[PDB]
Design a protein around this ligand. Structure first.
Ligand SMILES: *Cc1cc2c(cc1C)Nc1c([nH]c(=O)[nH]c1=O)N2C[C@H](O)[C@H](O)[C@H](O)COP(=O)(O)OP(=O)(O)OC[C@H]1O[C@@H](n2cnc3c(N)ncnc32)[C@H](O)[C@@H]1O
Ligand SMILES: *Cc1cc2c(cc1C)Nc1c([nH]c(=O)[nH]c1=O)N2C[C@H](O)[C@H](O)[C@H](O)COP(=O)(O)OP(=O)(O)OC[C@H]1O[C@@H](n2cnc3c(N)ncnc32)[C@H](O)[C@@H]1O
Ligand SMILES: [Mg+2]
Lengths: 581, 572, 51, 52
C-alpha cells in the first residue's frame, strides 16, 4: 500500500503531499479535474537543464500554476474576469418555472403543471436559504489557479475566553495555543510565499495607504490601514508579478527525481467514496480503501494506503464523506451520516459588500506633489509620465500597479477590508473611465456557527460528476445581520474619504456564497461532541482518516481562510508522519 | 543557421513545422504568447514520467466544459484581444462631482485605444489570440471546403485559382484538401447519433425536397472525433499537428519552440523596392522575465494570423503626422484588398410538434434513437421534452452555392442567456449563423500606425473597411434567407431574434498578405513566397485572395502545405 | 439635448446610416450644447398649471 | 465638497432603518433632474448684479 492517499490537488492537498513526500512517504493523489495550467522548471540533474527553454528538453511542466501569470492577463487585466467565470461551477441552482410570455406560440413551452426538467438544477434547494453563488473549481491546483492570493492571519483576542475569536483554539491552554499558531503561521507563510512588500513602489498603493492613514489619524475612532499580505512576488521586470499557486507547493515533486518517484498524481480521477472496515456508528473504525474512477475513456480502482486525506474543498470534502456512508455493493431525501454526525453542520459563509470609486480630482495634485518623505521614486515616475504625456489629465503613470490595502479585523470593527483592484467587467456608462483612478472595496463579514446551518447531500439527485447533489440550508443570525449592516455603513464611510462611487458599482451586497469562503463543513477542534475531527484533523473514531481545507475551520471568521487552512494541513501532516512514517 | 524560422504557432505555423521537420529540416518556431493548454502522449499516466506534454491542446477538451458547455463562452472571451478600439470622449453625467473626469478639451488618454481608427470603417470585433496554438485552442472546428463553380471563368468563386488551367487547378486542390483534412482530422460523422442533429438535418431535407427551389442540408465537417465514451468529443487543435515533433525524440531534436518570444521584425539584405531581396535575420525578443536575439535561418515563414502577419511585415519596413502610417513599398499590396464576412444570427426554440417526431420518428430503422428516447422517457416520465439529457447539439450546414452565396451553420455554440431566455431548456434551442462574403477591393485596407502601438509594442492596426453595393445586396438576401430557414422548424427565442453582428466578429479576416497568380495585385505567389524575396513565405487566412463565406482554416492549411513543399524543394 | 454621431455597428448594411463626414441632422437636438457643461435633465411642462 | 458630504450623509442616514434596494443604491442623478433651476432672471437688492 501507499503511505498516504490524498483526494484533491488544491493547495491543501498539495501541502499534505509536499510534507509527506519530504518525510520519505509514498503518496498517491487523485484529482477529479484536469491539469490545465502549467509553468515549466528545470528538472534537477538533467544535463539539458542549464541550456533549457521553457517546455523544452531539460524542463518539466508543473501543473497548478496561477492563470493570471500569463503575460496577456498582466497586460489586459480586466480580461481575467472571464477566466474566473470560466473556472467556477455553481454548487446548487434551484429550479424555477417562469412563464416566457413572448414565445412564438408554436414552440416547446413549460406550463403550470409540466415544468421543464433541466439538467444542472437542484430540485431540493430552497432558494431562500441557499448559498447561491457558492461554486467550485475542478482542476489541478483547485481554486488556487485563479485566487487573489490574500493571506491574512486570523484574529486572536487578548482575552482567551472572549465571546468571539476568528482563530480557532488548538489547546485549552492560552500560552500553548499561541505557541502552536506562531509556528504554524510561520511555516504556512513560507509554503505559500506571503509578502506585504510587493506593491511598495506603486503610486496608487502608496497614495491610498498613506492618505487613509493620514485621514484616520485625525478621527474620533482611529483605524489602521496596512498592506494586504499577498502570496506573490514582483519580478525582476517590475511590470510583472508572479501570483503564487499550488505549483510552488508541488514544484519539487516534479523537479526532483527522488521525490517524483514517491509521488503519483492521477488527474481526471474522481474519489467516489472511501470504504470503511464497518458501518457501525460510535465505534472505532478505519478506512480500508478509496474507490476511485478514471473519468477519461482510453476504470474503477481500489486504492490502498495506510492513511487517507480528503482535501477536496469545503463542499466536496463533505460530499465524499457523505457518499462514503453508502457502502459499496422520498424524492428529496438526504444521505444520513451517522458515522460522522456533525458532518455538514455549523456551516459558515461570509456576507460581502462591494463598491468601486473614482479617485478625487484633488488627489491628482497629491500625485504631482506628494507631501510624505522618501518618495523620490514616485516623483521621478510622475515626471517621466508628465513629460511623455503632457495632455493626460491623469499624472499617474500608465502601468502603475493597483493598490493592495487592508484594515485588519478587530472586535470593535469585526470584518475584513480589502481596498484594491480585481479584474472587473465595466458597463456602458462605467467603461468610459480610466483604470488608473478606480479603486475597489470588498468587505467580508463573519457568520456565527449554528448547528441548524447545514450542508446536506441528496440521495436521488447528483451533480455533473455523479456525486450526491449538495443542498444548502443557511440562515444568518440576528447578530450576523447587525454586523453586516454596520459593515455596509463602514464601507460607505471609508470609500467616500477618497473617491465617489463609480456608476454601476455603488455599494451593494453580493450573492451569498460569492466569497467562496464556506467553512465548518468538516469542522475540527477540541469539542469532540460538536466536531467532525480533532485538532489534528483526524476524523473521530477513524484511526487513519484525515480532512483538510476551509471546511475544518470551526469559527466564524471574516478574513481569507487559505493561510489558516494551510496551518491545519501542516498540523495534520505532522500527525500522519508521526503515526505512519 | 536553422533551415526554417517560423513566427507563430497556430495551426498554420504548426503545419509548416510538421512538414519541414518531417523532411529533415531544423526548425525554430517563435510564439509571442504562452504555452497554456496541454495534453500528454507517450514517447515513441497523463503528465507523469514516460509521457510527453504537448501544447496547443483544445481548451474545450477539458471534461468540465463537455459537462457545462455554456461555460466555455468565458474561455473564448478570455482568449480574444480586440485589435482596434477607437477613442471616445463620452460625458458620464452621474459621476460624483469631486472625482477625476474627462472634459471636452481634456479627454482621457487611455491605454489600449487607437486614436487613428474611424469607427464607421472599423472591424470593431476583429480580435486575436496569443498563445501556443493561436485561436485553435478555442475554435469551433468547422472545416468546409470552398466553392469552385463549374465554369472556371465564373465572375465569383470562393476557392482561389492555383493555376490558370482548370483541370490542373482542380487536381491540385483535390490533393491539398485531402492532405489538409488528414492534418487537421476533419470528419462529418461525429454527430450522427445525436437526436437533435438528426431531427434538424432530416426535417430540413424533408421540407426543402418539397420546394420549388431545392436546398440541401448536410452535416458540418468538424476537426474532432467522438470518443469511445460517446458523451465526450476530442476537438482538434495544434497539438495534433505538433504531436510527433514532441513524441519522437529524433524529430524533437530538430524542432525548437520559443514561447513568450515576439518576432519583432525581419531584417532584409536591403531596403530598395522592386529589386530582388532576402531576409537576413529575424529580430526576436524574449518577453518573460527570468532581451533581443537575432535568429538566422535559411528561410523565414510569417504565420502570425491575418492581422499580425501583416503587422510583422509592416514593422520590417523599418530598418533596425500623429496619425501617419508605416509605408510598405517593399510589399506594396500588404494590407490591401482585405475581406471579412458579414454575419447574421438568431436562435429558435423548436416547434412543439417536433417533440412528437422525437417520440415517433417517421424515418425507418433508427433503433439508436428510439432506444435513447425510450430510456429517457422511462427514467423522466414527467419531462415534457423527450430528447435525452446529454444529446449532442446539431451540427448542420448548407454548402455555399452561387444561387445562395453565403455559408450556413445550424448548430449550438456556447452562449450566455439573458434573464428572459435562460428559462428555456437547452435541448430545444438551435442557433443559426449565416456568413456572407465581401468582394476584394483595393481601397479596403489594413494599415499600421507609426506612433501608436499595441500592448506588445507592435504597430497598432487600423482598419479601413467599407462593403460594396453588391456585398450589401447579398447581405440583405442572406438575412431574408435566415428568417425563412429558421422559421421552418422553430420560433425566435426572445433576445436572439434575427440580427447582424458587429463587423469582424467572424474572425475570418483575409487578404492581408494575399497570394495568387496576379503578381501585380498580390503580396505573394501561389506558393505563398513574398514577391522579390527568395526566402520569405507567409501563411494564414491573410493569404487567401478571394471573397469567401465559408470557414477559412482548412483552405489556409492547404496553402501551408503548398508553401511547405516549395520550401522543402528549394531549401532541401 | 446635444448632438451625437454614434456608430451603430449592427445596422443592416443596406440601410440609411450616419457616417463620420455626414452625421444625421435631427430635429430636436441642440448643436451648440456642450454636453460637459449641460443640465441634461432640465425640462419644461407646457400646459395650464405648468408643472 | 458639499456634494460629497451630502452623499456621505445620505448613506449614513438611510442605513439606520434599512438596506439599499438592488438597483437603487446610492447615486448621483443627472444634472437638472431636480428642475429647481433658478437665478435666470434674478431679483434682489444689488442692482448691478440682478435683472430685477
Ligand atoms: C475562485 C477564487 C478563490 C479565492 C479568491 C478568489 C476567487 C475568485 N481569493 C482568495 C481566496 N482565498 C484566500 O485565502 N484568499 C484570497 O485572496 N480564494 C479561495 C481559495 O482559492 C481557497 O481557499 C483554496 O484554494 C482552498 O484550497 P483547498 O482546500 O485545497 O480546496 P480547492 O477547492 O482549491 O481544491 C480542492 C480540489 O479537490 C478536487 N476534488 C473535488 N472533488 C473531488 C473528488 N471527488 N475527487 C478528487 N478530487 C476532487 C477539486 O477538483 C479541487 O481541485
Ligand atoms: C476564436 C475563434 C476562432 C474560430 C472559430 C471560433 C472562434 C470563437 N471557429 C472557427 C474558425 N475557423 C474555422 O475555419 N472554423 C471554425 O469553426 N476560427 C478561426 C480559426 O481558429 C483560425 O482561422 C485559425 O486558428 C488561423 O490559424 P493561424 O493562421 O495559424 O493563426 P492563429 O491566429 O491561430 O495563430 C497565429 C499565432 O501567431 C502568434 N503571433 C502573433 N504575432 C506574433 C509575433 N509578432 N511573434 C510571434 N508570434 C506571434 C499568435 O500569438 C498566435 O498564436
Ligand atoms: Mg520564504
Amino acid at each position: 500500500p501507499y503511505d498516504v492517499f490524498i483526494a484533491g490537488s488544491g493547495p491543501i492537498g498539495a501541502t499534505f503531499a509536499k510534507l509527506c513526500v519530504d518525510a520519505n512517504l509514498r503518496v498517491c493523489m487523485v484529482e477529479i479535474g484536469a491539469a490545465d495550467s502549467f509553468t515549466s522548471k528545470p528538472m534537477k540533474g538533467d544535463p539539458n537543464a542549464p541550456r533549457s527553454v521553457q517546455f523544452g528538453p531539460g524542463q518539466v511542466p508543473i501543473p497548478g500554476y496561477h492563470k493570471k501569470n500569463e503575460i496577456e492577463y498582466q497586460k489586459d487585466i480586466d480580461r481575467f474576469v472571464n477566466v474566473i467565470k470560466g473556472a467556477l461551477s455553481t454548487c446548487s441552482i434551484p429550479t424555477s418555472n417562469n412563464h416566457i410570455a413572448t414565445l412564438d406560440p408554436s414552440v416547446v413551452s413549460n406550463s403550470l403543471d409540466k415544468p421543464f426538467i433541466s439538467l444542472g438544477k437542484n430540485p431540493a434547494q430552497n432558494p431562500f436559504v441557499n448559498l447561491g453563488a457558492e461554486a467550485v473549481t475542478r482542476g489541478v491546483g483547485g481554486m488556487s489557479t485563479h485566487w487573489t492570493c490574500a493571506t491574512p492571519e486570523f484574529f486572536a483576542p487578548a482575552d482567551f475566553n472572549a465571546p468571539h475569536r476568528e482563530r480557532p483554539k488548538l489547546s485549552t491552554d492560552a500560552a500553548e495555543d499561541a505557541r502552536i499558531w506562531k509556528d504554524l503561521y510561520a511555516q504556512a507563510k513560507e509554503i505559500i510565499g506571503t509578502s506585504t512588500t510587493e506593491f511598495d513602489h506603486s503610486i496608487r498603493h502608496n497614495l491610498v495607504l498613506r492618505k487613509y492613514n493620514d485621514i484616520f489619524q485625525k478621527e474620533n475612532v482611529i483605524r489602521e490601514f496596512s498592506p494586504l499580505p499577498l502570496a506573490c512576488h514582483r519580478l525582476t521586470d517590475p511590470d510583472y508579478v508572479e501570483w503564487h499557486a499550488t505549483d510552488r507547493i508541488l514544484e519539487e515533486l516534479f523537479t526532483d527525481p527522488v521525490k517524483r518517484g514517491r509521488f503519483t498524481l492521477l488527474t481526471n480521477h474522481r474519489c467516489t467514496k472511501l470504504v470503511f472496515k464497518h458501518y457501525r456508528p460510535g465505534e472505532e473504525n478505519e478506512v480500508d480503501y478509496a474507490l476511485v474512477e478514471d473519468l477519461l475513456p482510453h476504470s474503477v480502482k481500489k486504492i490502498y494506503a495506510r492513511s487517507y486525506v480528503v482535501a477536496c474543498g469545503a463542499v466536496a470534502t463533505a460530499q465524499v464523506l457523505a457518499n462514503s456512508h453508502i457502502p459499496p455493493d422520498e424524492r428529496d431525501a438526504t444521505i444520513p451520516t451517522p458515522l460522522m454526525p456533525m458532518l455538514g453542520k455549523y456551516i459558515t459563509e461570509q456576507p460581502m459588500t462591494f463598491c468601486q470609486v473614482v479617485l478625487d480630482s484633488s488627489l491628482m495634485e497629491v500625485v504631482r506633489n506628494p507631501p510624505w518623505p522618501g518618495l523620490d521614486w514616485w516623483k521621478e515616475k510622475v515626471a517621466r509620465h508628465v513629460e511623455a504625456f503632457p495632455n493626460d489629465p491623469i499624472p499617474i503613470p500608465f502601468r502603475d500597479p493597483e493598490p493592495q490595502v487592508t484594515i485588519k479585523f478587530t472586535e470593535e470593527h469585526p470584518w475584513h477590508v480589502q481596498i484594491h483592484r480585481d479584474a472587473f467587467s465595466y458597463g456602458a456608462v462605467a467603461e468610459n473611465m480610466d483604470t488608473r483612478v478606480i479603486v475597489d472595496y470588498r468587505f467580508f463579514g463573519y457568520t456565527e456557527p449554528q448547528e441548524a446551518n447545514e450542508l446536506v447531500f441528496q440521495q436521488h439527485y447528483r451533480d455533473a460528476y455523479d456525486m450526491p447533489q449538495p443542498t444548502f440550508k443557511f440562515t444568518m443570525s440576528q447578530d450576523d445581520r447587525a454586523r453586516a449592516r454596520r459593515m455596509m455603513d463602514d464601507m460607505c464611510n471609508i470609500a467616500l474619504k477618497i473617491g465617489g462611487y463609480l456608476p454601476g458599482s455603488e455599494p451593494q451586497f453580493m450573492t451569498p456564497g460569492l466569497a467562496l469562503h464556506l467553512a465548518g463543513t468538516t469542522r475540527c477542534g477540541l469539542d469532540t461532541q460538536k466536531t467532525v475531527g480533532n485538532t489534528h484533523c483526524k476524523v473521530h473514531n477513524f484511526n487513519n482518516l484525515y480532512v483538510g481545507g476551509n471546511g475544518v475551520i470551526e469559527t466564524g471568521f471574516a478574513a481569507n481562510p487559505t493561510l489558516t487552512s494551510i496551518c491545519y494541513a501542516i498540523r495534520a501532516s505532522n500527525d500522519i508522519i508521526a503515526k505512519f512514517g
